[PDB]
Amino acid sequence: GNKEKADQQKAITDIVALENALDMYKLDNSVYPTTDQGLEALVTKPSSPEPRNYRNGGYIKRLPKDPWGNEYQYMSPGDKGTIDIFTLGADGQEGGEGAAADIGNWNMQDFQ
């Protein structure tokens, strides 16, 4: 339970940080990065379509990986909201309970 708890807390903290970074990107550029541009758009200026007011040196120094060693997932346009930011949990797959549960910007509150 304890390590499970710590991992889920880290995931939540990471998603909040990423969402904050994404909001800063939109504040500067008027749009969010697309799915294809990805979270990598927060670290270096993306292409296709290239933003027109990109902050010198990006919006985050590096992308965190999730507690299970996997890259956070990102969709814009999202399925659960305007942008979806999530981890598929311990199992690296959709659905699951306990440490395998998916944690995203749309359901963080449940793990809180």
Cα separation, 5 vs 98, whole angstroms: 9
Q: How many residues contact Ca ion, by CB under 5 A? A: 6
Residue among 12, 63, 99, 100 that touches Ca ion (CB under 5 A): 100
Among 19, 28, 84, 91, the residue binding Ca ion under the rule CB under 5 A is: 91
Spatial contact of 91 and 100, defined as CB atoms under 8 Å apart: yes
Residue 16 tokens read as 């909040």
**Applying CB under 5 A, which of residues 21, 22, 42, 88 lies at the interface with Ca ion?**
88
Per-residue x/- track, 4-23, Ca ion (CB under 5 A) = --------------------
Q: CA distances (Å), 38 to each of 4, 6, 28, 96, 99, in order?
A: 27, 26, 17, 25, 25
Question: For residues 19 and 102, which CB has a smaller minimum distance to Ca ion in the complex?
Answer: 102
User: What is the closest distance, in whole angstroms, from the C-beta atom of residue 27 to Ca ion in the complex?
Assistant: 31
How far apart, in whole angstroms, are the C-alpha atoms of residue 41 and residue 33?
A: 6
Nearer of residues 33 and 66 to Ca ion, judged by Cβ: 66
